[PDB]
């Protein structure tokens, strides 16, 4: 049933799975585990430990990564158990911000990237730009990667190259055979 | 200009002028009027035959 | 409503006529 | 019957002058002596409450009013029986003798209609429609058809009911379609545009009102100045400036109508300022049109804010078509408004996709987005084209 | 023995009408008695004319009452009768030859999906979707709307409103029955509006005003003005007062997802049309909630597909775009293949007619 002594007893280990699941950038399985809990408004809503990933993901969906980053620092639960999933989830948050900084920032200097993503070193800031293929000039960082291509294999679908002229004529020949 | 006498539009910010050609439309959407009137009548007539 | 549009129109007239 | 409903409507809402309620009470006291207003006189406390609606000495006992003439007394109770005996008891005895003697055919039907009109003034609508239904079978030509339609037409103006009236007026008109002259057809045409104000049909109301004459006066059904405000306000909102120049602003009757009374303030103040594109004095005309026209009128008070809010959106469209760009400093200051007031009106209009415009913050330049050759084939052809295909799939996906 | 078993079931289905919402007998012995009258080879070998004679439509609303505050009353982990029911349910589909099975295949999945909606994990339900998809020709018009109702709800938890869009359209058009047009339709219309909550449109009340009672109109009207105007204070007070209605429909999750849409929808409501938007003008707009979140708020909304903008920290403004262009070469050709794809759904009418 639900009753042994303390029921779920430790609430921190249950929240470890919800915090570590977001490190893979999967938002579908995050809300699926919340439905698995028997009491949504009793154990999940009242206790701040089970409500920690909900309030953390709430700021992630609203778009604010600065308030979500403060929960992994000012919180006193990051000492022992949550220390393992702190830096791992923080690395996934910074990687998620990097996807936003491409489209939302046409040009940004080097000093701001350190402050926005909470970097402790300017040389380490440029190291992250090399793995993400970010062009670097004096006191500025541009993005030439806004254009996308490759993405596994695709043929005659999603903005083709040399078949554009044919597919337009092929779509006209498909309706003729349906009537015939 | 609003009376369809002179054709053009001005610029208040820079004090400039812009070019506006005389015809504003060809004949295209006039065929869509026959489509909207058909889908608002014949479609409603289909249920009268079924029911 | 009408109270919002009428109030902002009268308050601006007192300031505009004094300029 | 409309003279009382028009004056007593000012009793509902008066935000300025108290004398407006006492002046309108003089017309009510004069009409209740000649004809019994008891159905509407009792409807006064059943219409709008918490002003004069709590004062009655008979059914419900409370005293709160600015008008003490709407309460029953020993005089109106005796006059209610005197008007009930003469218009019903005395007349029905003479009609009963004509039924046994078999005098005429349409004369007995017309006598039942005139008798049926008296039940409407006594406050009994059961016998009013009962005597009217018996005379309906005797109606063939337009002689007895006008009187039958006249009784039902009173139900809309006198009782302020938009539901059971139009359904009966359409059935009588569609049974035998002749119309007589053009004025007898107005009873169906004028009430049509008036009913459109209850369900908010907007441009549908002015279809028959703009083509209607300005000299039409139905007296007990409607007044001269009342119908003048209906065609002027609704007709201006319907036809765009292209149709205003050849119809509204230049008309033989309309130019004669604006000079008759100053209570219009539509085809003069609003039309000239729109034609001359003067926005300095155009804004205070909307306040005078709202207070002195929309509020005192019956069916023009139902929309309220739906007039000024919609009319201000369309007047900007006339300015956007005459310029590619504009000046924010001139629109938010020189026209008589403020900066916060302009952002509040245009704040709700932009997300509704009601107009195409470019608003600037730092530069302060209001720019018009012009489709050029796009016109109606850009966003309308895809929305209306695929939107009707969704309605086509409704009955084809689920079959029956 | 097909006629002998069918003749006995004809008298059994008449009792099941009493067992459904009418006469519940006992809350203990009956659930054990209804199990022993089914298992012993009522479905047999699938000989001939076997369908609609099982429980099927009858037991949907039965077993849910015995599980809640009847046999269990939160005294155990799960009903042992339901544990055996899950064994018999999944055994019925395992022994199915996928030949004449149409309506009976989709009804049993409705239980395993509904269980995951209250207590359970919906992540494993995605694996059943690949098995659940079949061209069922025997499903009655009453169950065609329910079959499309669960498929649209699972995708809502999966954060996809595009796939669930096609299923919810055909759900409200079906089930003409009165009971399905009152309780089932009002619950389905709120889920149809829930798709608009994740999309960001939230249209006004026109057809839905007279189609349903005022019970569902009050929360949707308050959430319409809260998400459009971008006010989290009014949006928070709506969840508290209407919490009673949010829990029974499993819509309580809107405190996170829909709360994030309050900001995204308010972006298109306010006018960003001008290019360079100063940081102070953004802080003043959207009450004080937009003052704390400025650069991060716009950064995620651009990648999500709401708007397209550019942020400049040097002079402290944000360059925004309203997505307005003119058709020249590749612009009008984007919807060219889409309008052809829109007609592909209508190309199947040749085989239907």
Swiss-Prot record, chain A:
Domain of life (superkingdom): Eukaryota
Residue ranges occupied by any PCI domain in the UniProt entry: 1-159
Protein's recorded name: 26S proteasome regulatory subunit RPN12
Gene, per the UniProt record: RPN12
Known role: Acts as a regulatory subunit of the 26S proteasome which is involved in the ATP-dependent degradation of ubiquitinated proteins. Necessary for activation of the CDC28 kinase.
Extra facts: Present with 9890 molecules/cell in log phase SD medium.
GO cellular component term, pick one: proteasome storage granule
Organism: Saccharomyces cerevisiae (strain ATCC 204508 / S288c)
GO term, biological process aspect, one: ubiquitin-dependent protein catabolic process
Full protein stretch here: 93 to 272 of 274
Keyword entries, A-Z: Proteasome
Family: Belongs to the proteasome subunit S14 family.
Presence of the UniProt keyword Ribonucleoprotein in the record: no
From Swiss-Prot, chain B:
Modification after translation: N-acetylated by NAT1.
Record's function text: Component of the lid subcomplex of the 26S proteasome, a multiprotein complex involved in the ATP-dependent degradation of ubiquitinated proteins. In the complex, RPN6 is required for proteasome assembly.
Further remarks about this protein from its record: Present with 16800 molecules/cell in log phase SD medium.
Subunit field text: Component of the lid subcomplex of the 19S proteasome regulatory particle complex (also named PA700 complex). The 26S proteasome consists of a 20S proteasome core and two 19S regulatory subunits.
Assigned protein family: Belongs to the proteasome subunit S9 family.
Protein name: 26S proteasome regulatory subunit RPN6
Full-sequence range covered: 381 to 431 of 434
UniProtKB/Swiss-Prot annotation, chain D:
Coiled-coil region list: none
Record key words, sorted: Nucleus, Phosphoprotein, Proteasome, TPR repeat
GO molecular function, one term: structural molecule activity
Start and stop residues of the TPR repeats: 109-142
PROSITE patterns documented for this protein: PCI, TPR, TPR_REGION
Domain named PCI: residues: 201-373
Superkingdom, natural source: Eukaryota
Annotated compartments: Nucleus
InterPro entries tied to this protein: PCI_dom, Rpn7/CSN1, Rpn7_N, RPN7_PSMD6_C, TPR-like_helical_dom_sf, TPR_rpt, WH_DNA-bd_sf
PANTHER family recorded: 26S PROTEASOME NON-ATPASE REGULATORY SUBUNIT 6 (PTHR14145:SF1), 26S PROTESOME SUBUNIT 6 (PTHR14145)
Role summary: Component of the 19S cap proteasome complex which acts as a regulatory subunit of the 26S proteasome, involved in the ATP-dependent degradation of ubiquitinated proteins.
Quaternary structure (record): The 26S proteasome is composed of a core protease, known as the 20S proteasome, capped at one or both ends by the 19S regulatory complex (RC). The RC is composed of at least 18 different subunits in two subcomplexes, the base and the lid, which form the portions proximal and distal to the 20S proteolytic core, respectively. Component of the lid subcomplex of the 19S RC.
Additional observations: Present with 51900 molecules/cell in log phase SD medium.
Protein name in UniProt: 26S proteasome regulatory subunit RPN7
Gene for this chain: RPN7
Curated annotation (Swiss-Prot), chain E:
GO cellular component: proteasome complex; proteasome regulatory particle, lid subcomplex
Misc. remarks from the entry: Present with 16700 molecules/cell in log phase SD medium.
Function (record text): Acts as a regulatory subunit of the 26S proteasome which is involved in the ATP-dependent degradation of ubiquitinated proteins.
Lineage: Eukaryota, Fungi, Dikarya, Ascomycota, Saccharomycotina
Residues bearing the modification Phosphoserine: 329
Presence of keyword Phosphoprotein: yes
A GO molecular-function annotation: enzyme regulator activity
Keywords linked to the UniProt accession: Acetylation, Phosphoprotein, Proteasome
PCI domain ranges (all copies): 145-325
Known partners and oligomeric status: The 26S proteasome is composed of a core protease, known as the 20S proteasome, capped at one or both ends by the 19S regulatory complex (RC). The RC is composed of at least 18 different subunits in two subcomplexes, the base and the lid, which form the portions proximal and distal to the 20S proteolytic core, respectively.
BP terms from Gene Ontology: proteasome-mediated ubiquitin-dependent protein catabolic process; regulation of protein catabolic process; ubiquitin-dependent protein catabolic process
PTM annotation: N-acetylated by NAT1.
Record's keyword annotation contains Acetylation: yes
Family assignment from sequence similarity: Belongs to the proteasome subunit S3 family.
Protein name (record): 26S proteasome regulatory subunit RPN3
């Amino acid at each position: 049933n639900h009753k042994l002594s303390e029921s779920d007893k430790k609430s921190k280990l249950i929240s470890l799975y919800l915090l570590n699941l977001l490190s893979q950038n999967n938002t579908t399985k995050f809300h699926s585990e919340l439905q698995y809990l028997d009491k949504h408004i009793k154990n999940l809503e009242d206790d701040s430990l089970l409500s920690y990933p909900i309030k953390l993901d709430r700021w992630l969906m609203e778009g604010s990564y600065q308030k979500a980053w403060d929960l992994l620092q000012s919180g006193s639960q990051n000492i022992s158990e949550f220390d393992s999933f702190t830096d791992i989830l923080k690395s996934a948050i910074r990687d998620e911000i990097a996807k936003n900084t491409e489209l939302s920032y046409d040009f940004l200097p080097l000093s701001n990237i350190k402050a926005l993503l909470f970097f402790n070193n300017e040389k380490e800031t440029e190291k992250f730009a090399l793995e993400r293929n970010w062009p670097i000039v004096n006191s500025k960082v541009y993005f030439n990667n806004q254009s996308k291509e490759k993405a596994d294999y695709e043929d005659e679908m999603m903005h083709e190259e040399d078949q554009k002229t044919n597919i337009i004529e092929k779509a006209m020949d498909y309706a003729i055979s349906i009537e015939n | 200009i609003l009376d369809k006498i002179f054709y053009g539009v001005l610029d208040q910010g820079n004090g400039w002028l812009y070019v506006y050609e005389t015809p504003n439309q060809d004949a295209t959407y006039d065929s869509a009027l026959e489509l909207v009137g058909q889908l608002n009548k014949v479609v409603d007539q289909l249920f009268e035959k079924a029911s | 409503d009408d109270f919002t549009n009428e109030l902002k129109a009268e308050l601006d007239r007192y300031k505009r006529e004094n300029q | 019957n409309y003279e009382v409903s028009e004056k007593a409507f000012l009793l509902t809402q008066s935000k300025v002058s108290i004398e407006q309620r006492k002046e309108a009470a003089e017309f009510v006291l004069a009409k209740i002596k000649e004809e019994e207003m008891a159905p509407y006189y009792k409807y006064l406390c059943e219409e709008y409450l918490v002003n004069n609606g709590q004062s009655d000495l008979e059914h419900d006992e409370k005293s709160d009013s600015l008008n003490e003439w709407i309460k029953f007394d020993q005089e109106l109770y005796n006059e209610l029986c005197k008007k009930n005996e003469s218009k019903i008891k005395e007349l029905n005895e003479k009609i009963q003798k004509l039924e046994e003697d078999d005098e005429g055919e349409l004369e007995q039907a017309q006598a039942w209609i005139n008798l049926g009109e008296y039940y409407a003034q006594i406050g009994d609508k059961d016998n009013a429609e009962k005597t009217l239904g018996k005379s309906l079978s005797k109606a063939i030509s337009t002689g007895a058809k006008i009187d039958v339609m006249l009784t039902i037409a009173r139900l809309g103006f006198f009782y302020n009911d938009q539901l059971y009236v139009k359904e009966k007026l359409e059935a009588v008109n569609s049974m035998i379609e002749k119309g007589g002259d053009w004025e007898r057809r107005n009873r169906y045409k004028t009430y049509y545009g008036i009913h459109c104000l209850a369900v908010r049909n907007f441009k549908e109301a002015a279809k028959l009102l703009v083509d209607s004459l300005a000299t039409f006066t139905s007296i007990e059904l409607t007044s001269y100045e009342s119908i003048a405000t209906y065609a002027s306000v609704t007709g201006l909102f319907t036809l765009e400036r292209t149709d205003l120049k050849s119809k509204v602003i230049d008309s033989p009757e309309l130019l004669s109508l604006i000079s008759t009374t100053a209570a219009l303030q539509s085809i003069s103040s609003l039309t000239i300022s729109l034609y001359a594109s003067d926005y300095a004095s155009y804004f205070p005309y909307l306040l005078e049109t709202y207070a002195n026209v929309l509020i005192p009128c019956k069916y023009l008070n139902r929309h309220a804010d739906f007039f000024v809010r919609e009319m201000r959106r369309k007047v900007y469209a006339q300015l956007l078509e005459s310029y590619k760009t504009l000046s924010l400093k001139s629109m938010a200051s020189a026209f008589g408004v403020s900066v916060a007031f302009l952002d509040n009106d245009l704040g709700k209009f932009i997300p509704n996709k009601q107009l195409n415009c470019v608003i600037d913050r730092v530069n302060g330049i209001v720019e018009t987005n012009r489709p050029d050759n796009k016109n109606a084939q850009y966003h309308l052809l895809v929305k209306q084209g695929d939107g009707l295909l969704t309605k086509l799939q409704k009955y084809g996906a689920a079959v029956r | 023995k097909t006629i002998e078993v069918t003749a006995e079931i004809n008298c059994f289905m008449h009792l099941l009408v009493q067992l459904f919402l009418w006469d519940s007998k006992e809350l203990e012995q009956l659930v054990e008695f209804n199990r022993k009258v089914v298992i012993p080879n009522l479905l047999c070998y699938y000989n001939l004319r076997s369908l609609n004679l099982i429980n099927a439509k009858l037991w949907f609303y039965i077993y849910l009452s015995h599980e809640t505050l009847a046999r269990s009353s939160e005294e155990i982990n799960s009903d042992n009768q339901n544990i055996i029911l899950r064994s018999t349910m999944m055994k019925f589909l395992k022994i199915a030859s996928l030949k004449h099975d149409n309506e009976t295949k989709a009804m049993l999945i409705n239980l395993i999906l509904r269980d995951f909606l209250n207590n359970g994990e919906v992540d494993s339900a995605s694996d059943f979707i690949s098995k659940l998809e079949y061209p069922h020709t025997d499903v009655s018009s009453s169950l065609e709307a329910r079959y499309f109702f669960y498929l649209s709800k699972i995708n809502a938890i999966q954060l996809d409103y595009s796939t669930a869009n096609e299923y919810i359209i055909a759900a409200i058009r079906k089930a003409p029955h009165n009971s399905k047009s009152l309780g089932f339709l009002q619950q389905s219309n709120k889920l149809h509006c829930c798709i608009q909550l994740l999309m960001g449109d939230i249209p006004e009340l026109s057809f839905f005003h007279q189609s349903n009672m005022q019970k569902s109109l009050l929360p949707y009207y308050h959430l319409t003005k809260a998400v459009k105007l971008g006010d989290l204070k009014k949006f928070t007070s709506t969840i508290t007062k209407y919490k009673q209605l949010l829990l029974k429909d499993d819509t309580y999750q809107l405190c996170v997802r829909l709360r994030s849409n309050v900001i995204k929808t308010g972006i298109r409501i306010i006018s960003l049309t001008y290019k360079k938007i100063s940081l102070r003008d953004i802080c003043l707009k959207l009450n004080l909630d937009s003052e704390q979140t400025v650069e991060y708020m716009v950064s995620r909304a651009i990648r999500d597909g709401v708007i397209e903008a550019k942020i400049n920290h040097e002079d402290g403004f944000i360059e925004t775009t309203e997505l307005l262009n003119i058709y020249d070469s590749e612009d009008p050709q984007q919807v060219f293949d889409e309008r052809i794809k829109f007609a592909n759904q209508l190309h199947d009418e040749y085989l239907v007619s």
